Symmetry: T
């Protein structure tokens, strides 16, 4: 609706994603365990940092960030499912990639939204984030033997 709605929505998103990353991190099995386990820790730090920056930018424009698991669940478009059946490393990475994709497309919407509201600072912050998400999408798709936009 506006920048404050978008930013807050991403605070909810990033808190679900962050827990998803830990899910993959904890439950992964297979020959790529050691590298993807560590890779997940890197994603966790990186997206935890995005989330703090998003909330603090929300604060800076007069907004009020969601700040409970209850609120995050209610508001996030990012999905979570409990870990039940064993999943393949590729299936865990597909779920990671699908979420990276949703964030890319939503941030793209937020990039357009903020550009037309004239919120230059939030615009540029969202672009910086998308750049990194776009790079991760390429790399994780390459892990999956696929092209970035394939």
């Amino acid at each position: 609706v506006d920048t404050k709605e978008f930013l807050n929505h991403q605070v909810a998103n990033l808190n679900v994603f962050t827990v998803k990353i830990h899910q993959i991190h904890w439950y992964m099995r297979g020959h790529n365990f050691f590298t993807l386990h560590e890779k997940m820790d890197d994603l966790y730090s990186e997206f935890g940092e995005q989330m703090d920056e998003v909330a603090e930018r929300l604060l800076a424009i007069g907004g009020s960030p969601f700040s409970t698991l209850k609120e995050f669940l209610e508001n996030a478009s990012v999905e979570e499912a409990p870990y039940t059946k064993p999943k393949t490393m590729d299936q865990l990475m597909e779920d990671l990639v699908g979420t990276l994709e949703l964030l890319r497309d939503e941030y793209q919407q937020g990039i357009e939204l903020t550009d037309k509201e004239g919120d230059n600072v939030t615009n540029d912050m969202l672009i910086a984030f998308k750049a990194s998400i776009d790079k991760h999408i390429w790399m994780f798709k390459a892990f999956l033997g696929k092209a970035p936009l394939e």
Copy 2:
């Protein structure tokens, strides 16, 4: 119950607790803003580390950690509330200290349990976490003008 269930319960508690720490971090105001904004950053890292160590130890012993916000909410005894009304620094710190005290007393229950079960590794892990928690209770209570045990 057992060590697995206790440990899983703490995964849930620690996830609710880290988000609270962010809430305190985001909504704090007052002459102590700078010192406490930063101090909350430190608690965030430390309790995020505790969480990953609890989850991993649970994994090491044959368990399967909660790994969704839905599950954390279903299982945490740590309580959260949306920030729908302003709260002073002292009220936020009071909530923090009460949460630390809840974690201390629960960790104490787990320390006794793991000892009774003969799980020495989880026993020493939880003792080290309590050492830190006990230290924080002294310091944050000192901040509030109170003795550690109130």
Copy 3:
């Protein structure tokens, strides 16, 4: 690029006055929050001195000529300074800080619009990066004062 150059040179002047004011606060502050805000002012001083040098070199890079004397900074700055003559509270000093950060925020916003319209993309993004941080500072110092960022 006349106005972009003029705007940049205006901010060189502003930043040199702001930076000395940051020292004034650093030097003269008293109160229970001295140790925290004393150090805080060191950080602010470094950062806005760096903003200043970047602003100056962006100007040079577009064929401009930065103001480079105290006399030029005074003739040109919209940032206000006053000698410290009578004691001020920590809150009074932080209000003067915030007022000046709000001033720089709004003027940088005009610079961002200006550079956007002249198509100076480098300068545009630079001023945007500076404003990001200024907006973050305003939130934090206002929280210290017990006020919402825009109230």
Copy 4:
């Protein structure tokens, strides 16, 4: 020409330029040898890192970077010449400066094109690169005793 085509052209350019920086670095003679010999190592790193980011951005948008010397030579607008006749430091810095100007001018075209197409990430990336190039032009022109735009 679109964004992929522009980016891939710069992959070619950056690979020729990077070899030119090495040419200057190796053959330079004169009183400012020690500082400029070192400055060229810095330029080498920075522009090789530009190159990598341009190629990886290209990868992220679904393109395929040139990745052979033949391709770089076929596509580059940046020009190279073997080092036969000896040259003054000024002469070498004038080759370096002219090549910097070519890149600035071509990046400006890219900035505009990438804006038109709505590729915000590639847009910002190219603005950041131009910010550095523009700074380099001011500094190397000063070395030549010239204004940056003269």
Copy 5:
């Protein structure tokens, strides 16, 4: 036995184990070579440290550590075999894991022994070691696509 005999027994074990880790480090082949080759280095340092710490704790309680290959071979329960036939990465990891479990299980005896004997320092030393072994067991079993205890 007593604490001295147990500690000395482990000095023997850890020296056989350390050489085994080198064996795996040297002879390993397969797609996970680079990360696993490096991992073995990490394990080599860690278990070299345990060994020095075990020997020094033994020294500090009035004991005399085994200090020759002859004594290690005479005393170790950890087994070794010359590398004659090629082994797969999985088989190598299985030898690693099986030795880690042997150590975990003997350390458990040492923990229990040392608790009866009242040697609190050696007790906690051995608990800290098992903590790490337990974590390694989880991770290498995960690499093997198995639960830690299966």
Copy 6:
């Protein structure tokens, strides 16, 4: 938990005497092993001042009140001190050090048993970690003197 508190406060007293004893040795030592042992005392000084602080802060965390004056430390310590009067050899000084280490080891052992029975697991493990290092220093300083750790 009077006893855990009392034991901890006693060691606060002890460690402050011991820390000054380490400086005594640090300052007055002479002989061929000066450069090594002079620096070794600096390490011991840091480590035992760190123990002391952590003992005091744990006492604070259990609701105690740590001794915080030289007078209190002298009134309560079982660690002994003597002014440096007649010259002492390197070995003589190391024997005083080793002797104090042994006293603290044996007293920490008593506190380890005390905190066990009292159910204070945090203080229990703190004390164990401290004894681990003490026993290591005893082995090493006894080695310097040409003796076995427990002889």
Copy 7:
């Protein structure tokens, strides 16, 4: 008192002061807890280092430092009191400030004294220590809301 006796007097003072810093460190309460608790750690290091340098300068001029608590108590002009009555942060800082003022003025006596006895080294050392004490007095007075010499 000559240079030796002055220095030896300060060894005693510095040891009482150092224990006083710990007292404040331990017992402090109030909203400035976190920053001032940490500040006491800094002063503790700094004045411990002053003390080691004073004693080693004494050693270097043929002197014999006091090296027991008994001697320190017998010789110190710096005073201590057991912590009984709870004290505000300001009261603790007044005590800190008061003792810094004592040391400043005694060091000034040491500076004059040591100039007269032609001990240039001890002279410059004490000046350096006074420079920092003077800075502390200014900063700690500002905390108390006072001018430095007020």
Copy 8:
């Protein structure tokens, strides 16, 4: 030293082609080992770019004139390159890498024998050091391929 000079200049050409090949592999690779190999190609890139600068500067130091254009490297390289057209498995890309490493090992071996005969000792030891590292890479990358170093 014409033949030394000539050998060194030939390796400048080779190393520049190899380095772009490393980037080609780096950029296009796909498969379960992407994350490890992608970083490993960065290490290789740095290392062989470093070898290259060292080869060129040694050439400079002996009175030589390094090739310093893309055209000169192609005219003078024995390492071959081809545009990336059809998808290749990670093993195929590592086979191309190992093949090129082997070519350099073998050519450096010739350089080692040549500089020895000419008595250029510095170049000799520089080449040997480089070969040590290439021989090590061949072992590790053949092991990745499930193969023995020389099979």
Copy 9:
């Protein structure tokens, strides 16, 4: 202590004008030595900004009240500034730099004599350490100009 206070405050003023002069030189300089000198001014800027802050804080510590506006700095400084209007050579710029360093040397010498007479031993040593560094810069920059330090 009025003269020490006034002298210190006079130097706060000087160092603020000098500091902006160092940026003027840093920004406007051209010529073959550009890269070294441009970076060297960044060094002088940091060092002299540090000197200034230490002077103000020492002035604070002796009960003084530092000048803290561009206006006060201009009203009190003996160091002179002039806007950059016509181009100047690197030597011309370094001569302006050296001239200012020499003024500060000579004034600091007066402050060393003054603080010595007034018995301000701390300010005395501070001024001497600053002069030590100023004297070495005069040698080095004179050396840059092909001059002996004192000619």
Copy 10:
């Protein structure tokens, strides 16, 4: 004896030597305990690294390293003895020095052999190792109050 045999023989030696370093490190007593206890740690890492490099060079030339204690004992010319009766610091160092000299001398044989075979890499590796052994011999000989070759 060819290069592969020589290298494998050194794998055996270095593994016996490394344990002997630990023997000295653990059992030493006397006034120089602290520096020599430390120097043994440095030697252990250094000769542990020689060992790893020797084994890896053997790998790189198509060889197969000894990789068990049994193989090391079966193949080593370096001798070892349980610590049955206490040794002086001097005597422990003479045993250390004797082993350095043995290695030096054998490496000299390997350096000649490897020169005849035209293995330039292994040649240079062995020379670098001997450079260090030579230095240690001078240094440990000096500690013994003797010239390096007497």
Copy 11:
């Protein structure tokens, strides 16, 4: 002699001392080799730095440092002797001490002289140097079992 002559005399002395430290560093034997050997590198670097600061202060006052070995030999009061007869560690340390005492006492003259002359910078520089020299004398006399001024 004036300040310039005094400063220049110390450049000569310090260059001789510099080489004397190497002589001791190279030729020393005995149980304290490893400590003292490293101790001489520290001393070498420290007094090398003193010498450099002495020369540069001379330059800064309009002087001209001796800058050839011939000039150092012609002007030094520090004495050197070729190493012909072997010396104990103590004898070497006594030569080191003797030279330190010589520098102490001549610096003391330079301090008095530079005070009269009104050269404050040089006065403080020499005082800082003498402080370190005084400390070395205490420490090296302690090594020799003696009081500092014995």
Copy 12:
């Protein structure tokens, strides 16, 4: 002249040269002062290190290094001259370059001699030293606007 005598000769040479580096470092004037002044600091450390390594290598082969200025003057082939007249920066670099060339050629003799004697360690040390010297010659000749061997 054998290996011992050649190495000892370079001990002498290196001490003369290191003092020459200082002379140039102190007395240099001209527009390149700041970069060349620091470059001499680099050279001083580097050739300072060569000298120690030469002297310790000599020790290791049973020799006794020259260790007084008198012995260095009696033995050096490197020449020194008192700085009576100011020299140009180019003249100072010509003197520098000239001495590097002398060392290069004498190292070449030592390389040949040490090869013929079968001292592989010294051979390799000398080669490594010459590598750097050769690089310096290219670089300093480039500064002077000359080709390395011109």
